[PDB]
Symmetry: C3
Subunit: 659 residues, 3 copies
């Protein structure tokens, strides 16, 4: 099960199964262990009050691919199939199930979140029978209990050439905030006169279905497709009509043209790749990390991923610094247009950040700890991160400057980077307090180490304020605008303190407490405020054992790996690489949970960190403060013969590393 392009599971065990996701950055479909079913469907950009946190959330959506297959009236069940296998093809995000029904027939089904059509899904079903047989096929549209006020429709769209039967539902999110429409059709090869008659049943309040029968002859394969479109009032004013329009459009494009477009967009994503010689498990794991980041982002949008991307309702679908510092850097090096969408998300929410700053008594733009539709603060009120974890503003500034460093797009810096950098620098200039000694303090925050609450002069927070102020000043210079000279004066005097052993102090109350995640070590990478290798090493030695095994998220060990790679320590770098994700895995597809032994995949934030350990750590790739991508000294794991990284920077460079 160590194909470098395919994740595979034989006989899914429903008692120990964590589904995999196919997604196009707009819709995510999470697999079921049951044949011809999906577990959960998530639509990006649709938020309403729902369950966790009493704040906006992603909403479980229509399981629009759900199918029932019968042979001569006998429904497919666990007890009557064999050689049941699932496979995820990471080359094209195809999720395939295959099984034999008794000794009678073989069934394959592949489904796709179409890469070029953000709101369109397709499942292709192939049935090969060894004897004459009749199939009954049903597609069910069950309204999930997350939605209300549903309506269940069915109609025929016809002309002299086609009969497109549409199974449509329209429903609302819990508070009525968003109207959802879904529209499904069956595609046949045999043409209007010979295609099966489609029946419609509405037997339940929350479910309707379309169905057909088809005679298949011995030794013949019968193929059909299910196309679905899923869209909301967050995406279009009239989702009901747009869903039916899209499904009609996709039906008359046809399966071939749809899969060809899908393949072309996936081929383009995989022009940036990471190849490992000598470690098939690492090769597959790293492909899975790239696959999930590619599936959970979309170029040419203003979409940003949640910590769980489109794998479910993890962290309510909210956007955190998990994007800017964890998922954004590897995407900026491999596909700058993905990074551009992530920062566009923030640019279009700058108004909401100015409003938050004003409500909390500050100048400029104060980005929220958790962001959703509006860009207003969305953190559950019971979590003190929302009111007090202020480094997110610096994290947004850092990503915006990095975008310009890697692309050199000065028109983007004028139109979007500078508005962000100027407003965020104005925030920090208003956020600091000058003390007796002329130093600048940032008092009463929640640390990057979120176990440290309502403390002063957090190392990471203060570091992000310094970088935000420096980068805003640098930006002003590049564009020929005059920056307040106070920004540089403040940056040079923001407190970063050492304990008596010379170790960077996490905050003013810090001695030897356990910490949730990397904080002081982040001043070495990503901030590069600490470059002295002896300082980097003494900070690693003091803090690396401060992170407990339990209830600590995957936002630490990838940084330890990267820093040990920069120190040219192969044994420590590889130890921390494995520790970053292997103890977090869930079967049968090695999806990644947030914490060690956790059960909440897929934590895309964790994948983003590990990709930095591979690209920036083992590959030595670095955003040069002066612009572009440079390469610094690195080591490989002992057992890696070659590391090849393709599509890096706007010159699309290939880097090869060997021992």
């Amino acid at each position: 099960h160590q194909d470098p392009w395919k994740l595979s599971a034989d006989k899914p065990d429903s008692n120990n199964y964590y589904g995999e996701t196919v997604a196009n950055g707009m819709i995510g479909i999470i697999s079921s262990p049951e044949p011809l079913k999906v577990k959960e469907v998530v639509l990006a950009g649709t938020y309403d009050i729902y369950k966790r946190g009493r704040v906006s959330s992603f909403i479980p959506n229509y399981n629009l691919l759900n199918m029932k297959l019968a042979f001569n009236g006998e429904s497919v069940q666990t007890y009557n199939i064999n050689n049941y296998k699932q496979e995820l093809d990471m080359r094209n995000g195809a999720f395939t199930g295959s099984f034999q029904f008794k000794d009678l027939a073989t069934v394959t089904y592949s489904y796709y979140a179409l890469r070029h059509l953000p709101h369109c899904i397709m499942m292709v079903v192939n049935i090969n029978t060894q004897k004459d047989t009749e199939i009954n096929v049903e597609n069910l549209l069950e309204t999930p209990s997350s939605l209300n006020n549903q309506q269940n429709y069915f109609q025929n769209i016809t002309n002299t050439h086609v009969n497109i039967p549409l199974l449509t539902s329209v429903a609302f999110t819990p508070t009525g905030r968003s109207k959802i429409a879904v529209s499904n059709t069956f595609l046949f090869d045999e043409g209007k006169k010979l295609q099966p008659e489609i029946l419609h049943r509405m037997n339940d309040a929350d479910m309707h279905a379309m169905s057909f029968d088809k005679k298949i002859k011995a030794g013949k394969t019968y193929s059909f497709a299910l196309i679905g479109s899923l869209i909301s009032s967050d995406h279009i004013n009239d989702p009901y009509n747009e869903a039916e329009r899209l499904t009609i459009y996709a039906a008359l494009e046809g399966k071939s043209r749809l899969l060809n477009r899908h393949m072309q967009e996936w081929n383009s994503l995989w022009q940036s790749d990471i190849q490992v010689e000598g470690d098939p498990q690492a090769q597959q794991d790293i492909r899975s990390m790239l696959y999930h980041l590619y599936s959970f982002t979309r170029k040419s949008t203003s979409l940003s991923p949640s910590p769980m991307g489109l794998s479910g309702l993890g962290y309510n679908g909210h956007v955190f610094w998990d994007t800017e510092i964890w998922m954004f850097p590897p995407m900026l090096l491999l596909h700058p247009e993905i990074a551009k969408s992530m920062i566009e998300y923030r640019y279009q929410r700058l108004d909401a950040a100015r409003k938050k700053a004003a409500i909390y008594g500050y100048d400029g733009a104060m980005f929220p700890w958790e962001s959703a539709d509006s860009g207003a603060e969305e953190t559950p009120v019971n979590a003190l991160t929302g009111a007090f974890e202020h480094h997110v503003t610096g994290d947004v500034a850092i990503a915006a400057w990095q975008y310009y460093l890697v692309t050199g797009d000065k028109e983007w810096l004028k139109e979007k980077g500078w508005p962000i950098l100027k407003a965020t620098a104005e925030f920090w200039a208003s956020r600091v307090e000058k003390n007796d000694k002329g130093e600048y303090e940032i008092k009463n925050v929640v640390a990057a180490d979120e176990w440290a609450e309502n403390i002063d002069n957090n190392a990471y927070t203060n570091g992000t304020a310094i970088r935000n102020l420096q980068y805003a000043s640098k930006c002003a210079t590049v564009l020929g605008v005059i920056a307040p000279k106070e920004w540089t004066l403040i940056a040079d005097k923001i407190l970063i303190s050492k304990m008596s052993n010379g170790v960077t102090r996490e905050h003013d109350s810090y001695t030897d407490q356990n910490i949730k995640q990397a904080d002081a070590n982040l001043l070495a990478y990503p901030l590069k405020l600490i470059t002295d290798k002896e300082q980097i090493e003494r900070d690693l030695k003091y803090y690396q054992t401060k992170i407990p095994q339990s209830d600590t998220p995957a936002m630490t060990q990838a940084i330890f790996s990267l820093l040990y790679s920069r120190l040219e320590d192969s044994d420590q770098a590889y130890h921390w690489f494995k520790d970053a994700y292997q103890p977090n895995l869930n079967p049968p597809f090695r999806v990644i949970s947030e914490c060690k032994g956790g059960t909440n995949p897929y934590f895309s934030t964790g994948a983003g960190g590990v990709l930095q350990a591979v690209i920036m750590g083992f590959g030595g790739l670095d955003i040069d403060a002066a612009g572009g991508i440079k390469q610094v000294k690195s080591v490989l794991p002992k057992n890696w013969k070659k590391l090849t990284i393709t599509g890096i920077g706007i010159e699309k460079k290939t880097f090869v590393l060997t021992h």
Copy 2:
């Protein structure tokens, strides 16, 4: 009935009557055969789900002018009046009825959609007595069944000088999308103390009325006016209060000031005119065409006409390429500020076109087949045009570029034209497919000939893509920007094929099918991709008999006329000019239906086409590719002694043509 300024009807026949429209580009009022009634009122910019197509629509509104008149308690009806006449004065959009009631009085009523006050209507009533009589006058506000949740109000607005009685209704469009308010008052000459007492009745759920009595001695003229304001939440946040404010304002202005401003604005519109010597019927018909375009548009707005303007709910009030290619060109030459409003409609909806392109898997801006409030796709889902008729994007680009060519407004090109041309070119660059031979194809469209569905390389569509890419490239140069070299490479290699007889092929599946309307011939005019006179002629000979007599819209024969004028063939040009509209007329005012023998006037699209046959065909006027208006060779109909076109181009040039 061939007055060059007035359309007149004696004794309206309600069994064979198609009403005429007065409009100010915001409100349209369509005439009733019944005296002192109107059939329908339409407010621009107000759309909701209603009847046809399951998509947004114009909504029948308050018939706010409806009046009941009694003489000595005897109700005035079609059955008991004589010498009843109706007249539309095209000089000032006055609709006038006049009749005799027995031996008592002559009644004249004139109503107006006030040209300067977009939301204000006025009816003026004169009663000339032959005997002593008492009139009872009632103004009815009946909530049409298109509206719901109505409220019926009445109050006196007073000071020492006035008593302004306001009859107000507020109601909602079917889904609650739009709140409509209407407020009416009576104006009297005799002043506060002597004016009639105004009674209010609320006897029905869906109707209330204000009324008065007045004794008039024999041989006197008694005059009163009704002023109404009609506005919605689409136009103003508080329509209820703003309707009352507007009616009070208009009442205090008075009839004389209102009609003087109205006259001044209509006089300005008619400073661009078409004068024909030798053909009184042509002179009246052409004045009717100009009058309807002037009535159905408004300078200094973001309004664009539907194919039926404000004559009713034709095509749901949606905006089509009917504006860009059919109504826009004659308005650009006569009144560029009207053309500016039409293209402003599209500029304001550029973000909705970007959203459509993303949903359908393209780059840039994909303008919708049918547009309404948002600029999202509004085509009924049962019509494949909405998903597949893509030339509308090129049509918007062509109009944008022509606006700049005619005005030379480089500031408008920078702020609005270029955003349109750049985004629409980016769409076409993403829409084409390169083939093995290095040609660019546009596969799977609905043709301009909409009977050809899901075909490849439509002539008109491919031509609009070429022009969009060429004009965007030219625009970039005017503004000192380097357009992507790909735009010219694609433009130069987009497929336009010929059949073995050398005739331009309509699409890759086209041999000799009947066609709905002009498609390949549009490559000659308006696109001017075909300039060779033998090629123009070969294409006319092959396609001119491909358009059936039945169920074919007025989007063909005007182009045939214009092309035969350009070929200096007076007999063919005049044949096609008459065929373009005369078989489409409805009595008694020669309004134009969409198709031959049709009954759905007024098809403003057809008038726009015919006005191009007159201005660009008979007049030889042409948009110069290098800027401004030029004149090419033309002919007149044999029976036209002189054609005079005034107010052309930003120099407001007069063109005179004789034999």
Copy 3:
């Protein structure tokens, strides 16, 4: 009772009591004569249909500070306390009450509209015991009858260190337009383990409460604080969660940190101050005027004050020219960043002014007589000012140009000032009529003297049209853009006439009528179209006799004062300075009513005028037509030994004047 920083009342008389306001430009809290109660709370920016005028209004909000205090089960009332005093400290907007309860304790309470946290309020209560006692403390959240569909919540926010009990309500404005959230907590000094248990009662439909008991030994001080956050959907998408988040934030900042931040911001505001030597009552009155303008405005916003600021529902909270001409000039000289917010309010409402112009048949931007949320007209329909008092458009233009003169901010002129000046100039160019003598008239207005309705060529109106046209032309020159030459042509020929007595004629129907307020005198100041001191004196001597004692607002005598100050006549200047506000005062805090003997305080318009009489009049300070502030000839009242004005202009200049 004549402290230069504090307003004091002994034993409030509920039968003759006009409450004083503490405000931060977002929340106003108006005092009750009853201990530990507030009369009214107003939230800026929240408007809905409510009572007066049938148009949008400020809404009475939660009296969130309402407290009930009992000693040994005995309820504290006005009738059983003694030595009860109230005091407003203008230095920090602290409202303090203090009283003795029998032989048990002294109670002191101080409340604040926190200056740095626009949505946060704090009350601090100190109990100083003379005997052992037990207090019962209740904080009540009563939903006012202005709101509907309330919900009453209570929860504990806890961690190892804190238990923050939140008393929260959520409700809606009358039409459901706005959702309001309020969240309160108690702060204690003693810590989580020792703090009182907080009980919650929900006994009424419209009220819930949180309460505690505390035993206090004799001779001890016990202190507690109430913090509350008040916010709406007009301010934030999710007011419910944002109110709770803000109160948690404020609780974990704590009383000391909040008051320090509050004091810092009030210290900054008072860096611009007016010091009078030899007249303690004038010193205190002028402080009260500065205090109210500082409390009723907020830098770095788009808020503009109503005529009553946040003192209540006066004039529905609508924005009038009372800002541009009355409150804006003193704030522009003292704190340009306050003036910037006031003009930002108009800039962000330019689209609505363009819409109003279009609806009334004009070009450009027509600012409404009364403005609220959208910028559309909000004047009650029964008042003709809404449709007909047109000088407001010139008033906005004047303020926009003055902002540029005083700041010299050319980037602001390009982005905001020019859009205002260009559109308002276009309005006036479309508003004038040229007569047979080549002069420009403005006909059928309501005058600045609002008693003159539907008249022609109002002096002040014509003056503002001239300045608007001139300043738009000067603006075009500053930015190097071409202005229509018609603006200068029109400005030079707009009619301002003299009657046969050599007095400027108010309008074309004016001879000797009583006038509501200053009109023709405003051509001298502020417009400075009349600089001839003899014409100023003629207009002064005539019109100063025409203002009746009754029903005439404080928009007159302050100008008389300033002009007599400019002519160097102390006795007259001082007479009109006193008449401007002293006859409009309400006890016991000398709050200002709109009219002489009025009962509708606080008329901040009136304070604005008088501050101009002091700064521009007695101080001789003037906005120089060429940029910055200059000083012309002035006099002081006989009895004033010295006038000092600090923080003037962007140079922050101090001006000292003596006899």
